[PDB]
Amino acid sequence: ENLYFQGLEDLVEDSHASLELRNFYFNRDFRDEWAQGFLLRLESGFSEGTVGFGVDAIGLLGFKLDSQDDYAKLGLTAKARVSNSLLKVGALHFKSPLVSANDTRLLPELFRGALLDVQEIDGLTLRGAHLDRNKLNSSSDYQVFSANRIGGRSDAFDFAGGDYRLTPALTASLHQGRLKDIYRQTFAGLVHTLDLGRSLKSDLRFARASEDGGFRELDNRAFGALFSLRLGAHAVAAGYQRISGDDPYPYIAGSDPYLVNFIQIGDFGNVDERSWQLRYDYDFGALGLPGLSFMSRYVSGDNVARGAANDGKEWERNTDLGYVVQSGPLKNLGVKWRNATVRSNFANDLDENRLILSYSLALW
């Protein structure tokens, strides 16, 4: 009676829910898809007690329009909290150096598994996960994993990692993971944030991977550095990335790699690839146009392995223009245009346009 009945009420009492509408148009021109999506998110409260329990749900629905994102899926996530720690089991969507779920299409990628987040020690976040399925952004069904470019088949991704604030400005990270029967990978990172009150973020990354289990021998290293300068409404970033070893940068296929020069289309993670990035952002708020945004970036890669040579080269430009309605009936309605051009001597030259209309409504 009592505590159990009350627990079920408390799950609802402290719950919240939202509905997102997305209209997505995509075109690729080599030197076409329109779809509508709905995303219903429910997050329960927790039952009272030292250990609190809850449940989240995500409802996804997509269909193609005339002018594979044609599915419906409901995913549940059981959760438990104690002190400042949280366990989620079921449908997962999160970002971390060794595994990050994608959401740059119509409907999000989901993983099936368990994710633990422990924040009991001052300045220290410890995370770990066991994942056993990948639901690609464009499909309804959970499937087993493979690695980007490298292939393979795996039914387990495991990682643990810590992000530690050594000082208020400096955070050190170490994450270690395994895509079972394909690869092992470890990531170290150091991120320094200098606020001049005007700011400079310095983001250094290094990851090494080797084979796991009976998989063929694998050797990859990836160094990245990204320096992000904010100057009022302006932002400028400069990035450098170096891939080395016999193999390209491994990550779960369908998901996002934690590479500083991973942009709209390319990851710049090819064998031996050296690349640099320049990025500019302007926030129109100060000018008096608060919903408006502009970003443009350019990444140039060389040294890419082409057989026994290293004369592979590619570049990619991206430009994002966006507006979010600030007031009136259509407040929160957003439109984003993402335009990309890729030119390469080892892959397909491509131009891509995305147009995304989005609207989110808080239900309660």
Numbering used by the authors: -8 to 22, 31 to 66, 86 to 215, 218 to 384
The publication says:
In such microorganisms, the majority of small molecules are taken up by members of the OprD outer membrane protein family. Here we show that OprD channels require a carboxyl group in the substrate for efficient transport, and based on this we have renamed the family Occ, for outer membrane carboxylate channels. As expected from pairwise sequence identities that range from 35%–50%, the Occ proteins share a similar architecture, with a slightly off-center constriction formed by the inward-folded extracellular loops L3 and L7 and residues in the barrel wall. The transport data demonstrate that Occ channels have a pronounced preference for substrates with a carboxyl group, due to the universal presence of a basic ladder on one side of the barrel wall.
To determine if the phylogenetic subdivision of Occ proteins exists at the structural level, we determined X-ray crystal structures for seven Occ family members (OccD2, OccD3, and OccK2–K6). The pores of the proteins within the OccK subfamily show a considerable variation in size and shape, suggesting differences in substrate preferences within subfamilies as well. The next substrate tested, pyroglutamate, has a similar activity profile compared to benzoate/glucuronate. As with benzoate/glucuronate, the channel that is most efficient in pyroglutamate uptake (OccK3) was indeed predicted to transport this and related five-membered ring compounds. OccK3-mediated transport is affected only with the cephalosporin cefotaxime. OccK3 thus appears to serve as a specific entry channel for this antibiotic, which is borne out by the liposome swelling experiments.
